[PDB]
């Protein structure tokens, strides 16, 4: 009945909802618009940190990266406070995952692929994980603003779930690197009202959110049942009918996750 429940969510919230939960050995795949493109918004910062971690020795995380206040062209709660100091790469990975800092992400992009090639190199990193569908094309903030229907800066819940399933559950990062990506997302500050709110509090929830224009509200998560069985949950939504300033409805994501929690019970 999962289709009819998800469709009622789309009726009630006036939204397009995309859900993908990969099949496990015990469970079938839960999928709803799972192969439609949704904007990444800030969800790309999780694989972005993975890409930085993967390409460099843990020594790189202590390289201090300098930037100005004019480099702050986006919501940057943490970077905001060093508009001349500089941060260490590990702290940008931190700010980019936990506070969704936009400046952190732009700097992490530049670290990854240089001044002109950050989004191509990020995209290439996903390609190397077997994701041939996702694309990042702009930096912060333009990547949150592409028109509905535009393929630029989009992923699919299917693609980003499979990517996530390789980063946290798979062997895409060495144990220590994997451990730090898992740490940052589990200490996220932004996801309380989305997938986390839809899952019973003794399931473990690790996530990275994205929010953008056209009512875009995303959460990608790995969750662990009380007995430790891991599931990956990608929930993406937009409310494009309302125009660029349409309000995102976090509660839609929480509800999606509640349905997911009820079939993985």
Numbering used by the authors: 29 to 293
Please share text taken word for word from the publication where this structure appeared:
We have therefore crystallized BlaC in two different crystal forms. With polyethylene glycol (PEG) 1000 as the precipitant, needle-shaped crystals are obtained with one molecule in the asymmetric unit. The solvent volume as estimated by the CCP4 program “truncate” is on the order of 59% for the shard-shaped crystal, and it is substantially lower (28%) in the needles. When measured by the program Coot, cavities with diameters as wide as 90 Å can be identified in the shards, and only 20-Å voids exist in the needles. The reason for this might be that the enzyme is more tightly packed in the needle crystal form. Since stacking is not observed in crystals that pack in the same way as our needle crystal form, it might be argued that it represents a non-physiological, non-specifically bound substrate that occurs only in the environment in the shard crystals.
